[PDB]
Amino acid sequence: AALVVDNGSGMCKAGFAGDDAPRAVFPSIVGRPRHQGVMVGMGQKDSYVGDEAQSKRGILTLKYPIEHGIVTNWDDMEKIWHHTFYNELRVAPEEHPVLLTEAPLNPKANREKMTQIMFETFNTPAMYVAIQAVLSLYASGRTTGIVMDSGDGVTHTVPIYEGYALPHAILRLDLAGRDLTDYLMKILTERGYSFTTTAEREIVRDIKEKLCYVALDFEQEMATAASSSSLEKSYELPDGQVITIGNERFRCPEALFQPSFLGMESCGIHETTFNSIMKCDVDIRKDLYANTVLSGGTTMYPGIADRMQKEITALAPSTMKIKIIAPPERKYSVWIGGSILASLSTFQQMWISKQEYDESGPSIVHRKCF
Amino acid sequence: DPKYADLPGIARNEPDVYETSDLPLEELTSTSVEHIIVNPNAAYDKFKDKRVGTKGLDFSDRIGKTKRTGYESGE
Amino acid sequence: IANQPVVIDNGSGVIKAGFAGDQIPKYCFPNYVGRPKHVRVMAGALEGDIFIGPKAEEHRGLLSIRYPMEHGIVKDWNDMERIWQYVYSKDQLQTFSEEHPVLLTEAPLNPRKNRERAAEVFFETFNVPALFISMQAVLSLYATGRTTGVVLDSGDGVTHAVPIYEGFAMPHSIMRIDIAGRDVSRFLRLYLRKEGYDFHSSSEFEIVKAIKERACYLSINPQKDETLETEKAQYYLPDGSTIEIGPSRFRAPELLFRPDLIGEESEGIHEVLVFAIQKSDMDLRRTLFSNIVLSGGSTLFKGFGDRLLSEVKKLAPKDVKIRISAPQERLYSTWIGGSILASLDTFKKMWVSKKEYEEDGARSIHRKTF
Amino acid sequence: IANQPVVIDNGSGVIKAGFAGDQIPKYCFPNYVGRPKHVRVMAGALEGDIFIGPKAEEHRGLLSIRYPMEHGIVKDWNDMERIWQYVYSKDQLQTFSEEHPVLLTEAPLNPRKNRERAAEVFFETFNVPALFISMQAVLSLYATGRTTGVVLDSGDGVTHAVPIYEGFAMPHSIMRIDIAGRDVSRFLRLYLRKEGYDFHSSSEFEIVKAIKERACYLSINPQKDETLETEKAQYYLPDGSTIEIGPSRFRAPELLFRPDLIGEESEGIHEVLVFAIQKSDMDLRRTLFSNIVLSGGSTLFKGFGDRLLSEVKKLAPKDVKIRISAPQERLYSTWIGGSILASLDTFKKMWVSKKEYEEDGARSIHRKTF
Ligand SMILES: Nc1ncnc2c1ncn2[C@@H]1O[C@H](COP(=O)(O)OP(=O)(O)OP(=O)(O)O)[C@@H](O)[C@H]1O
Ligand SMILES: Nc1ncnc2c1ncn2[C@@H]1O[C@H](COP(=O)(O)OP(=O)(O)O)[C@@H](O)[C@H]1O
Ligand SMILES: Nc1ncnc2c1ncn2[C@@H]1O[C@H](COP(=O)(O)OP(=O)(O)O)[C@@H](O)[C@H]1O
C-alpha cells in the first residue's frame, strides 16, 4: 500500500501504487474569484481547485502554482495536495507513504520545501522524490535508452544506459506546452480571434490538444496552407461561436523544433536530444539512438515521432539506425513508471522515513534523491 | 512653445519629467605566489644579442633521418 | 509622386490628419459617425443621415453617436470609409486623395485582416499613389528625438507598452491590454449613476468623456482620499444644469492602475510598463527604465506621472533610476513622429506603390511594414 | 622590415592585439561576434549585422553572443576572419595588414588543420608579409625574463603546462586538458539554476562570467568548506536585482582541480603540473619544481596559488623546494612575451615569408612552428 502523486505543471496525476492507470487526473490550478465589494451568493468556496475550477472558469482567475517545474506559490500547492489526498483519492496521508515527482536540474529549495510540507503538514510516514525521466523508462520495460520527456512546464533529456544515468549529459529546456499555448494565442490574435484572460487561455489549450499536428516539412506545409483550404479545420468554443484556425494549426507545434519563433535563442527539442547523446560516452551512443523514448503530453502531437526521426537522422551519422519509442499511453508515462517502482520490494528500502527526516533534517532528501 | 499654444488638448502647468532622486586583485596580494614585476625594456636587452639557426630546421612529425632539434645556434 | 505625403493617425477616440510639412496636425476631429437619433421619415429634420467631426459637435444632442473603431480594431468598415472620405473633404485638408501619398498608424499586435482591409480601401476606393502602415509606438520616439526608449502609449481604445533600444524593437516584449480611456469613460458613467446622475444615451456618453477629460485626478494614495471628505466640485453641462461629481472623480481613472476592482482580468498600466522591461534582456533593463516615454491622451490625467513613478518603483528593482519623460504634446505626439518620418527621404523606399500591390499580392503591405 | 610587426594573442576569451616594442597591449577586446536578435523597425538605429569588441559590450542586451573558438580550436572560421578583420579596422590599431608582419599565439597540441587554415586566412584574405605561429608558454617565459621554468597557462578555452629548461622545450612532457575558465562559467551557470536563478540567454551567460570573476574563492580544504554553513554573499546584477550565490561560489572553481564534477575523465590542474614535471628527465625535476610560472586569466581566482601549492606538495616528492611565481599582469603576460620576441632581430629569420609559404604551402608553416 503506497501512493504515487505526479506534480506536473499542467496536470497532477495521482493514484495508488500497483494500479494500471492513475485514479484521479485533474488540471493543477487554483481558482480565486474576481470578487467586487458586492455580497456573494450561497454555496461559495473561498478558493476552487482542479475539475471544480475547470467547471467555474468564467469568473475565477486561473493561477498555475508550478511555473517551469518550480513551485512559485507553496500555499497554492498545499491546497492542490489537500484536494489530491482527502477529496480526489479519498485516503489519509498519515496511513500511506507518498512518492512525488520533480523535473531534473530544478532549484534545490524546490525538493527541500516539497518534502518539508509532506513530513510536517500532511505527516506522511515516508517520502521519496524521483526524476520524471527515470520513471518514464519503466513504462516501456526498457532499462537502456534516452527519453525526451516534454511536459507542460519543462522538457528534459535524461540518458540512462543499463540502469545507470549520466547526470552531466542531462539538458533542460524551458520551452514547453504552456509556452506553445501562449504562442498559439498570439498567432490566433493575428488571424482575428482574440484570447487574453486566464479562462480564455484554458480554451486555447483545448483547441491546441485537438487540432494542432507536427508537419514533416514546415516550408512545404506553409505552401499547401497558402494555396488550398484543406488544412483549415473548424472548432466550436464553449460559446456557440465557431473559429477556423487555418495554417496556425501546424505553426504552433513548429516552435518545439525551432524556438526562434518563440524567440528564446535556444536549440530545438530535436537538436537538444542529439546534443545530450553527443555529451554521453562514444560507445553507449548506439543504444541511445536505437532507444529514444518520447514521454509527457507534449509528445502526443499527431506525427511528432515522424518529424523527430527525420531531424535526428539528419544530425546523426548515416550508418546509425534511429528508432523513436512512442507508446500509446505517453500522457500517463511518468505515473505508470512510479506505480511499477513503488510496487517493487527493492524500493521498500529506498524510502526516506520520518525518523530519518527528524534527526538529519530536510537536507537528507539531496543525498537520497537519485 | 507657440506651436503647443495653438492646439487645444495640451498639458499646461505640468512637469515634463517625472524622475526618482539621483542616488550617488585578492589573488594578486597572496603570500603563496611570488610577485614578479614585468619590465619588457630590461627583458629586451637580455635577449637583444641572442640569435637562432633556422638552417636545416624541421619541428614537424617527420620520421626520416633520426631526431631533430629546431634552432641550432646563434652567430 | 513628389507632392507632400498626408499623415493620418487611426486613433479610436480622435483621428489626427494633416500634411507632413506642418509641425502640428491642422485638422483633428472626433472619430465617430453621427446619425439622427429619431428615425427620420419627415422633411425639416437633419438631412444626409451623416454628421462627422465639427458638424456632429454642433447638433450633438439630436444625433446618435456610433464609434466605428473599438479596441484598435475596425468593426464597421462602411463607417470608417465615410470618416476617411471626410478627411479628404472641403471641411478638412481640401485635396485629392489620388495625388498625395498616405501614412497610417495602426496599434501594435492588431489582426492581419485589419491591416489587409485598411490597405484594400485606401488603394481601391481612394486611388492613393503609395501607402505605409506603421506602429504607433515607433513614431512617438521620432517626435521626442531619441532612438532608445519604452513607449507606454495609452490611447482611447487600447493601451500598449513597446520597448525599443537603439532603433531595435523586441517584438516578444510588446504588451497590449484593452483597458484604455474608453473603458475609464464607461466605468465613470457607472460611478456617476452611483452618485445618482444617469447618462443612458449614446450622445450623453460623449459628455461623460468631457466630464472625465475636465475633472478626474489620480490620487497618490487612493485609500486616504476615500476616508477624507470630498469638496464635491460642480461641473456645468451643455444644457446649463450643474452636477456634483464628488468621490467618483478620483476612483474612476484608478481602474487603469487596478482593473481587478470593477472585475476586468488585466495586468494594469503600471504592470504592463514594468513587465515589458522585465520581459526584455537583463543588460537593457536599466537603460529602458532610464528612458520611458508617455504617449496618447490617457496619460494626461492630473497626477498620472506622479502615481506611475510610485507604482513602478515598488515593482522595479531597488536603487534603479526611473525617468518617465512625458512631452508637452502627448495627445499629438504619435502624429508629429509620422510627420518627421514622412519628411525623410528614407520614407520614399519604405512605402508600397499602387502598381507594387497589384503585382506582388496581399503580403506586400505586411512584409514592408517593418 | 621598417614597419613594426603586429602581435595578436588569439585567446579563446579575450584577443589582445598591438605593435611590437609596446610595454602593454593597447587594444584588448572580448573574442565574440555579436548579431542583433531583435528586429530593426526605426530609422537611425545601430548600423551593421556584426558587432565586435567595445560596441558589442555597450549594446550586449540587444545582441546574441557567439564565441568563434572553443577549447583553443576555431569552430567557425567565417567569424574568426571578421574578428581579425576588426583588429586591423579603424576602431583598434587602424593600419593595413599588407604593410605589417604578424605574430599569432596558438595553444600547444592543437589540431594541425587549425594551424594550416590560420595561415591560409592570414596569407590569402589578408596579404601579410610574414606570419610566425608560436606557443603561449614559450612567450610567457620571455616576459618574466627567465630561461628555466614550467608555464601553467590556465586560459578561458584550454589549460596547459609546458616544462622549458634553459631555452629548450620538451615536446613529449607537454600536458593539455580541455577543462578551463569557460567550463567553470558553464558549471557555475548549472549551479546558479540549482540555487534558483536562470541565465538561459547567450547575453545572460556573459553576466555569469562577470559573477565568476567578481565572487568565487578556491577553499584550501574542499571537504571542510562543503560541511560548514556558508555566508550567503549577495551580488548586484546589471538590472539591479540581488542574487545570493551561497555554496556555488566556492564549488564552481573547484572544477579546475577536480574534472570529475562536470563528468570528464581527465587530470586536474594540480595533476597536470606535477605530471608535466614527472614526465621530464630525473635531473631537471628539482629545477622545474623550483621554477613554476602561472599564466592566463583563470589563475587570478582568489586562493588559486594557496590551493595549488597545497595540492602540488602532496603529489610531489618529500623535502623539495616548490616556489610558484606570479607575474602581476598574469592576463597580459603571453602578449608581452610576443612583443619582446618580435622586437629581436632573430625574429626576422624565424618568420615564414609570403613567397616561402606560396612555394611549399602548408608544410612551411608546420616545419618552422613548434
Ligand atoms: N493530445 C495532446 N496533443 C497535444 N498537446 C497535448 C495533448 N495532451 C496534452 N497536451 C499538452 O501538453 C501538456 C501535457 O501535460 P501532461 O498531462 O503530460 O502533464 P505535465 O504537467 O506535463 O506532467 P509531466 O511534466 O510529469 O509530464 C498539456 O498541458 C497540454 O498543453
Ligand atoms: N486632457 C485630457 N485629460 C484626460 N484625458 C484626456 C485628455 N485628452 C484626452 N483624454 C483621453 O484620451 C483620449 C484620446 O486618446 P488619443 O491620444 O487620441 O489616442 P490615440 O493615440 O489612439 O490617437 C480621449 O478620448 C480621452 O478619453
Ligand atoms: N579576476 C578573474 N578571476 C577569475 N577568472 C578570471 C578573472 N579575470 C579573467 N578570468 C577568466 O580568464 C579568462 C581570460 O583568459 P585569457 O587569459 O585572456 O586567455 P588566453 O590566455 O587564452 O589568451 C576570462 O574569460 C575569465 O574566464
Swiss-Prot record, chain A:
Name listed for the protein in its UniProt record: Actin, cytoplasmic 1
Lineage: Eukaryota, Metazoa, Chordata, Craniata, Vertebrata
Gene name of the encoded protein: ACTB
GO cellular component terms attached to this protein's record: actin cytoskeleton; actin filament; adherens junction; apical junction complex; axon; brush border; calyx of Held; cortical cytoskeleton
E.C. designation(s): 3.6.4.-
GO function term, MF aspect, one: transporter regulator activity
UniProt-annotated location(s): Cytoplasm, Cytoskeleton; Nucleus
Residue(s) carrying N6-methyllysine: K79
Modified residues (Tele-methylhistidine): H68
SMART domains hit by this protein: ACTIN
PTM entry text: ISGylated.
Pfam families xrefs: Actin (PF00022)
Keyword annotations: Acetylation, ATP-binding, Cytoplasm, Cytoskeleton, Hydrolase, Methylation, Nucleotide-binding, Nucleus, Oxidation, Ubl conjugation
Quaternary structure and partners: Polymerization of globular actin (G-actin) leads to a structural filament (F-actin) in the form of a two-stranded helix. Each actin can bind to 4 others. Identified in a IGF2BP1-dependent mRNP granule complex containing untranslated mRNAs. Component of the BAF complex, which includes at least actin (ACTB), ARID1A, ARID1B/BAF250, SMARCA2, SMARCA4/BRG1, ACTL6A/BAF53, ACTL6B/BAF53B, SMARCE1/BAF57 SMARCC1/BAF155, SMARCC2/BAF170, SMARCB1/SNF5/INI1, and one or more of SMARCD1/BAF60A, SMARCD2/BAF60B, or SMARCD3/BAF60C. In muscle cells, the BAF complex also contains DPF3.
Catalysed reactions listed for this entry: ATP + H2O = ADP + phosphate + H(+)
Function (record text): Actin is a highly conserved protein that polymerizes to produce filaments that form cross-linked networks in the cytoplasm of cells. Actin exists in both monomeric (G-actin) and polymeric (F-actin) forms, both forms playing key functions, such as cell motility and contraction. In addition to their role in the cytoplasmic cytoskeleton, G- and F-actin also localize in the nucleus, and regulate gene transcription and motility and repair of damaged DNA.
Family per similarity comment: Belongs to the actin family.
Curated annotation (Swiss-Prot), chain B:
Top-level taxon in the UniProt lineage: Eukaryota
Subcellular location as annotated: Cytoplasm, Cytoskeleton; Cytoplasm, Cytoskeleton, Microtubule organizing center, Centrosome; Membrane
Chain spans, region Disordered: 1-23
Modification Phosphotyrosine occurs at: Y4
Transmembrane segments: none
Modified residues (Phosphoserine): S73
Subunit structure: Subunit of dynactin, a multiprotein complex part of a tripartite complex with dynein and a adapter, such as BICDL1, BICD2 or HOOK3. The dynactin complex is built around ACTR1A/ACTB filament and consists of an actin-related filament composed of a shoulder domain, a pointed end and a barbed end. Its length is defined by its flexible shoulder domain. The soulder is composed of 2 DCTN1 subunits, 4 DCTN2 and 2 DCTN3. The 4 DCNT2 (via N-terminus) bind the ACTR1A filament and act as molecular rulers to determine the length.
Role: Part of the dynactin complex that activates the molecular motor dynein for ultra-processive transport along microtubules. In the dynactin soulder domain, binds the ACTR1A filament and acts as a molecular ruler to determine the length. Modulates cytoplasmic dynein binding to an organelle, and plays a role in prometaphase chromosome alignment and spindle organization during mitosis. Involved in anchoring microtubules to centrosomes. May play a role in synapse formation during brain development.
Family note: Belongs to the dynactin subunit 2 family.
Protein name in the entry: Dynactin subunit 2
Source organism (scientific name): Sus scrofa
Gene: DCTN2
Parent-record interval covered: 3 to 87 of 405
Curated annotation (Swiss-Prot), chains C, D:
Gene3D superfamilies the UniProt entry points to: 3.30.420.40, Actin, Chain A, domain 4
Pfam families in the cross-refs: Actin
Any one GO cellular component localisation term in the record: cell cortex
InterPro entries associated with the record: Actin (IPR004000), Actin/actin-like_CS (IPR020902), ATPase_NBD (IPR043129)
Superkingdom of the source species: Eukaryota
Localization annotation: Cytoplasm, Cytoskeleton; Cytoplasm, Cytoskeleton, Microtubule organizing center, Centrosome; Cytoplasm, Cell cortex
Keywords: Acetylation, ATP-binding, Cytoplasm, Cytoskeleton, Nucleotide-binding
SUPFAM superfamilies in the record: Actin-like ATPase domain
A GO MF term: ATP binding
Cited function: Part of the ACTR1A/ACTB filament around which the dynactin complex is built. The dynactin multiprotein complex activates the molecular motor dynein for ultra-processive transport along microtubules.
Protein family according to the UniProt entry: Belongs to the actin family. ARP1 subfamily.
Assembly and interaction partners: Part of the ACTR1A/ACTB filament around which the dynactin complex is built. The filament contains 8 copies of ACTR1A and 1 ACTB. Interacts with dynein and adapters such as BICD2. Interacts with BCCIP (isoform 2/alpha).
Identification of the protein by name: Alpha-centractin
Organism encoding this protein: Sus scrofa (Pig)
